[PDB]
Structure 1
Amino acid sequence: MLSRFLGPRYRELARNWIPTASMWGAVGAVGLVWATDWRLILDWVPYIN
């Protein structure tokens, strides 16, 4: 039923938005590492201990 998302040029629209969407998964890898102070990835970089 959801082959409205199935067009020859509709999957062309994923190619020009995933470079913006390649990155905000790494904001959660950096933003509540800030907030809730997770000690897992404070082991990672020698800037912070």
Structure 2
Amino acid sequence: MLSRFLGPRYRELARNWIPTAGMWGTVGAVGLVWATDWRLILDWVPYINGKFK
């Protein structure tokens, strides 16, 4: 996007912060399917299959 953040140090910072960002994305996805009660996701988890959701 910009030439200020291009280099090896910023690539190392991105590699450092990418598993934390992926874990936060997983947190957001689980929170989204928990709050919205998404049936296409929740009808494959074995314990909550009896909730009909």
C-alpha RMSD of matched pairs (Å): 1.7
| Rounded Cα–Cα distance in structure 2 between residues aligned with 1:28 and 1:10 | 25
Between the aligned residues of both structures, percent identity stands at 96
TM-score by length of 1: 0.75
Instruction: Evaluate the alpha carbon distance shift between residue 14 and residue 40 of structure 1 in structure 2; reply closer, same or farther with a 3 A threshold.
Output: same
Q: What is the number of equivalent residue pairs in this alignment?
A: 49
| TM-score with structure 2 setting the length | 0.71
**Moved segments of 4+, more than 4 Å:** none
- The structure richer in helix per residue is 2
- 5+ unaligned residues in a row in structure 1: which ranges? none
